Design an enzyme around this catalytic site. Structure first.
Site, mmCIF file in Angstrom:
data_model
loop_
_atom_site.group_PDB
_atom_site.id
_atom_site.type_symbol
_atom_site.label_atom_id
_atom_site.label_comp_id
_atom_site.label_asym_id
_atom_site.label_seq_id
_atom_site.Cartn_x
_atom_site.Cartn_y
_atom_site.Cartn_z
ATOM 1 N N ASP A 26 0.844 -1.170 0.000
ATOM 2 C CA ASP A 26 0.000 0.000 0.000
ATOM 3 C C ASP A 26 0.884 1.226 0.000
ATOM 4 O OD1 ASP A 26 -2.221 1.587 -0.027
ATOM 5 O OD2 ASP A 26 -2.993 0.971 1.954
ATOM 6 N N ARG A 44 0.093 8.898 1.480
ATOM 7 C CA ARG A 44 -0.736 8.834 2.683
ATOM 8 C C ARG A 44 -0.213 7.807 3.690
ATOM 9 N NH1 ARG A 44 -3.559 6.207 -1.349
ATOM 10 N NH2 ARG A 44 -3.490 3.932 -0.977
ATOM 11 N N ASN A 45 0.729 6.967 3.263
ATOM 12 C CA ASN A 45 1.267 5.944 4.165
ATOM 13 C C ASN A 45 2.741 6.171 4.454
ATOM 14 O OD1 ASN A 45 -1.125 4.564 4.529
ATOM 15 N ND2 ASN A 45 -0.844 3.341 2.658
ATOM 16 N N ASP A 81 5.218 0.769 8.276
ATOM 17 C CA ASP A 81 5.541 -0.627 8.026
ATOM 18 C C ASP A 81 4.769 -1.615 8.885
ATOM 19 O OD1 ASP A 81 6.676 -0.097 10.467
ATOM 20 O OD2 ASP A 81 8.741 -0.265 9.763
#
Ligand SMILES: Cc1cc(Nc2cc(N3CCN(C)CC3)nc(Sc3ccc(NC(=O)C4CC4)cc3)n2)[nH]n1
Length: 269
Positions: A131, A135-136, A149
């Protein structure tokens, strides 16, 4: 083990992320008076055995650009995952809200370099993120960037994970083989990175703007690709395009990607 904490070793201060990231808090690890990030998982919000595997995986991650695990509470729900606190929160809002005189071309290079460093590490260590997106990623002081993670997966680098049907993806970051056949690999992370590059180059614009999600796969199979962002250096766009090769094996490795950005960043200085 050494990672297991008592739930009371931590105290919660503020809800974080406006819902977009679940039950997450700014907390205090009382012993060390250290601000930490805390994610609390109620039951029926995740499958226990898979959560424990994801936690087991974080325990093995040590890299300057991957969020560092500090502890876990994994006996009685709710479960806790405790990590280093990144002060500025997610990279997407950060790009959108920043002073571009400060967060300039060379900082963007810096951020892409840090992220590819993380991904090169995952590539070396037989993990896949699935993903990867702005945004991550999390931002700390001085444009320090770390890839989140928590939900990583063990997969021998080069192999392919076939996800179950009925699985839903974030379409606009998702590689062709993944959209069509549910196949994920380090090369699909490379694809997603390319889109992350585009998000960085545009300071957090939504990708494939205006494009109906139902038509994205069809466009890609006809070699449509997002246009070069205004101001984006040609070498960087070339990296984008190399990441969006139809053939997974035609995409560069993260080791090759990071080296390319390393050069550009040190040169831009
Ligand atoms: C993991 C982590 C997260 C953070 N820092 C932050 C900081 C933050 N805030 C920073 C300040 N702005 C004004 C509001 C948002 N918002 C989030 S929103 C958020 C919170 C948690 C997670 N993910 C996890 O906790 C996974 C590791 C278990 C993702 C996004 N995370 N530092 N370390």
């Amino acid at each position: 083990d050494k990672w297991e904490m008592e739930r009371t070793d931590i105290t919660m201060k503020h809800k974080l992320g406006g819902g977009q990231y679940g039950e997450v808090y700014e907390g205090v690890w009382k012993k060390y008076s250290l601000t930490v990030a805390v994610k609390t998982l109620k039951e029926d919000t995740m499958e226990v055995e898979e959560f424990l595997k994801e936690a087991a995986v974080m325990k093995e991650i040590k890299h300057p650009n991957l969020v560092q695990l500090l502890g876990v509470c994994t006996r009685e729900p709710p479960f806790y995952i405790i990590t280093e606190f990144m002060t500025y929160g997610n990279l997407l809002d950060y790009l959108r809200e920043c002073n571009r005189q400060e967060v300039n071309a060379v900082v963007l290079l810096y951020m892409a370099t840090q992220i590819s460093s993380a991904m090169e590490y995952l590539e070396k260590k037989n993990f896949i993120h699935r993903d990867l997106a702005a945004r991550n990623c999390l931002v700390g002081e001085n444009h320090l960037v770390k890839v989140a993670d928590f939900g990583l997966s063990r997969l021998m680098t080069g192999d392919t994970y076939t996800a179950h049907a009925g699985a839903k993806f974030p379409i606009k970051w998702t590689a062709p083989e993944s959209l069509a056949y549910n196949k994920f690999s380090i090369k699909s992370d490379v694809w997603a990175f390319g889109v992350l590059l585009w998000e960085i180059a545009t300071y957090g614009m939504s990708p494939y703007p205006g494009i109906d999600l139902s038509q994205v796969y069809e466009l890609l199979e006809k070699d449509y690709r997002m246009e070069r962002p205004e101001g984006c250096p040609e070498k960087v766009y070339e990296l984008m395009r190399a990441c969006w090769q139809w053939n997974p094996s035609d995409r560069p490795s993260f080791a090759e990607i990071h080296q390319a950005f390393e050069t550009m960043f040190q040169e831009s200085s």
